[PDB]
Amino acid sequence: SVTADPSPPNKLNKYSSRITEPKSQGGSQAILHGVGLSDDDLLKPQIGISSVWYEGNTCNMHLLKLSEAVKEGVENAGMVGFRFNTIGVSDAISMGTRGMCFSLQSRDLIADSIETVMSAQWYDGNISIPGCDKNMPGTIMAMGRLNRPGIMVYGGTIKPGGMYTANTMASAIEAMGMSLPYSSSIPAEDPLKLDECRLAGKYLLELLKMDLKPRDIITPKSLRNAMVSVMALGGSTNAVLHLIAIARSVGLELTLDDFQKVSDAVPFLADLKPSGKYVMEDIHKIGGTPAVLRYLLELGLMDGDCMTVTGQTLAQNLENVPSLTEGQEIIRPLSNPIKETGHIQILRGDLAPDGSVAKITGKEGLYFSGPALVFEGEESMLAAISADPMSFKGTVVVIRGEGPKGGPGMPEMLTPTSAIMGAGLGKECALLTDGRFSGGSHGFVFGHICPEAQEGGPIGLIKNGDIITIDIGAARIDTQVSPEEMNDRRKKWTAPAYKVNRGVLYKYIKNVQSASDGCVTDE
Amino acid sequence: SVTADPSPPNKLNKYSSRITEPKSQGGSQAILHGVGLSDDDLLKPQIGISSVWYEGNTCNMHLLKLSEAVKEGVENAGMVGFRFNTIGVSDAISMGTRGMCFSLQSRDLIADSIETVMSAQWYDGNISIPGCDKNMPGTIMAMGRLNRPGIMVYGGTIKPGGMYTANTMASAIEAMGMSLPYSSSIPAEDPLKLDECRLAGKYLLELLKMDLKPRDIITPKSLRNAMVSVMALGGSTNAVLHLIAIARSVGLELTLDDFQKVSDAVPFLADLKPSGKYVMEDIHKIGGTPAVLRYLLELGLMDGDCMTVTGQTLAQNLENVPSLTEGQEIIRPLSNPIKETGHIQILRGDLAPDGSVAKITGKEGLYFSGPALVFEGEESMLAAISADPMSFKGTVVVIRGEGPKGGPGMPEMLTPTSAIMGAGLGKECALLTDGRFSGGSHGFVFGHICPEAQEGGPIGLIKNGDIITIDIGAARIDTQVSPEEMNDRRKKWTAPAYKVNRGVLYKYIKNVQSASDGCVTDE
Ligand code: FES
Ligand code: FES
């Protein structure tokens, strides 16, 4: 099925032998001697160590230190380590600006970057070190494409001075068996994080011996395990995009309806910010992600037979770990969940026929109806609510043209919800977008609406005054406009000009699939 | 024309003010304090320092040290430096393997990478530090897209224990005014290279004060200056691909015929490997690239009025620099050139209607004719010459399916010429490809043939036995087969399946333009 990267020419150096053994590759051997390899080093496995260090983010500035520890442990395990580094960007910096147009796509750029180096240099395995920014799914996608043994070492969340995207994905990737136990919950710069770094080489050596590859570890069942952790912990709706992209990277299928089925089957149990009170460090103090997953596995919610990067199954990893600390108030018992099903909800209906994603707490009621108030981008919406906030009362606010192609880049938006809260309009309107809304968003806020306006989806045909009725029980975002009149509007509609004609965002427009398809770019 | 990256909201912090000044961006300011910025620091320009450090190549493993020096100089010039790093790959490692399919595209990946970080973080200027691998044009393309003040600090060529792509592009980019004087000729790890690093911030500060941007420096005339250095130094045919890509990045036009015109107008003067005897370090010892360019300008071959990253014109930079050392034998006088015109030749004809590129020394005669010997890739060609070398005598060897889409990745090939040389067949056959042959290639060796075979170009219609006649004076690669019979073949031809269906190379297939178009990917 998936055909992307070179095949190997059992041996632990299945790939690097392509350039270390035949003499026809003497030029390769000469460079390797030049970078410090001895004759005996040429026989060893070669590990690409890919960090996402950069200085403009607290979540990434210390990752070179972690990458050094990883290399030391790779050497202490009898292998050769080759460090390299790719880009990443900070949403806390770019939030509220057109810089956010470059954020989501950097995930796919990172996947391309790591795939490129691993393929060109013939490395046998990968250890990736993403920070607590949001691009780490990119490292897993690269490993799925290559299908060489790999481990993701989460850089760690910063201690306080929330289950946003980074904590959501780190936890989910640990649940999926691609990070070592506790990787997601040990804080950044904790001494145990450095120790994890120094042990990744030992574990990867064993995966090379077993030839336990990413497509042996990432399976329909381990993908479900990842989704279970998202639902139980209240994780971010961005997980829909990222877990779909990860599933596609290994040649598997994952749809919006798979997310609904897991959501319906898993209660929301974790009293964690943004919805709740506690943060990832509090999880760390009561037994960490392994304790949480042990509990979910004991409740029968997880498949324990899935292989992991420990070289053992999830159940074998969790059998021994300390359980959640007696008396802890963070993870609710199954009898008293924060919500009986998951926060993440898939909705269709007239205006989102190919899907949409919401975070529903169960506290906001089942219906909203109002006349549409339509904005062609975040900027006009913010201006209108500044000049005339009362015009928003009772409306269904539509911020369109913010999808993967229309944005471009499917930017995450935070100011619209803040402005609505600040104007006292929180329970008095609903919000629709073909883009995304930040992690503090919940209730009658719907993102990822497909097809996006740029593609002529119904969201692009809404007019001011159209009566929109959102029904959470029926999972529908409907319009009072007749289907015939919306077809009339579709016939008279023409795509707006793209906002760019060059550069990385124009390539994204040329390559990106819909949000319901995880915005994958390589299909 | 070019619309790619965010516009600024005179001030030296034209871009970073978007996030450092507004109270609406308090979250940006909080991260900036978190990474170490004081209140006063928030008023300073912010410089993105993008290195291409990685450990699997001698040409790149020491660039973090250079990046630290660049940051120190940025601070010593009253600005804030933010270091980040992107990927790169080694052709010496991957030569002869399918890993080479990932090499050329990493140029475009690096441009996307640097563009992404600069755009998302709102940096005011860029200092890029590529190594002596081959991807440095990517850094210039990113600067062209952004059109923010920028300087390329060449990492330097390694001292001996050649005018290949890296030296060709470093020299050409210095000639085009986007590197400081001597950047291309100071050896890697020379003390003066570290000093250059520590001065880049001083120079960039002045460019911010003048607002002297990449599109003010990269112009039709400075592009011609770059091409002049390529012809005079005997630089690599790869410069055709990279200078076109750089020209497109600033919204300019540059065609194959432009290269022919400069080639016809500029003699080959430099006795430098691969064609000649000396190496870049020998240039360094007789006055460096500025001394070479000073001579070329005195001969009237260069435009001295072009602005450069010194904040002055090329003529102003070169007026003072020491001239070529008295008695040096490396750079020939104009009266005794190694070749009266440049090595780089554009050829069309029946089999390359959209162009092709050759390195012609003038020592190989004007014609070759022989029956075609056709291979669908490098591997089959190498096998045939191993089993039956005499079957190659007198033929025109065709290695097709090695273009941007067919390869995929337009890999550079070295073993075919080596095998031909080793079999004693060097003057006794010709070589055609839609891919590329390495820098040791010259004479009746023709690359970049367009349209490529994957695209149904005539090269994909050749059959064994077809009489192919190459005429260097007429600049034609012709076939004895009638145009009508070639149309008969085209009508019965169907494109082969792509060799990949996922990953970064499938995206390259989806995005890449022809070699005659510089293999740009963002149009
Ligand atoms: S920017 Fe790193 S997680 Fe918000
Ligand atoms: S690999 Fe760096 S220039 Fe040849």
Numbering used by the authors:
A (entry chain A), B (entry chain B): 4 to 12, 17 to 168, 213 to 574
Manuscript text:
Dihydroxy acid dehydratase (DHAD) is the third enzyme in the plant branched-chain amino acid biosynthetic pathway and the target for commercial herbicide development. We have previously reported the discovery of fungal natural product aspterric acid (AA) as a submicromolar inhibitor of DHAD through self-resistance gene directed genome mining. Here, we reveal the mechanism of AA inhibition on DHAD and the self-resistance mechanism of AstD, which is encoded by the self-resistance gene astD.
To determine if small-to-large amino acid mutations at these hydrophobic residues can decrease active site volume and increase resistance to AA, we generated multiple mutations at V496, V497, and I177 in AthDHAD followed by kinetic and structural characterizations. Additionally, the inhibitory concentration (IC50) of AA for the V497L, V497I, and V497F mutants were determined as 0.059, 0.0733, and 1.25 μM, respectively. In the crystal structures of I177F, V178W, V496W, and V497F, the occupancy of [2Fe–2S] cluster is 0.64, 0.72, 0.63, and 0.77, respectively. The overall structures of the AthDHAD mutants I177F, V178W, V496W, and V497F displayed high similarity with the wild-type AthDHAD, with the RMSD of 0.123 Å (888 core Cα atoms), 0.275 Å (994 core Cα atoms), 0.142 Å (1,034 core Cα atoms), and 0.283 Å (994 core Cα atoms), respectively. In the V497F structure, the benzene ring of F497 induces F495 to rotate about 53° which change the shape of loop 489–493 and make it close to the V178 at the channel entrance.
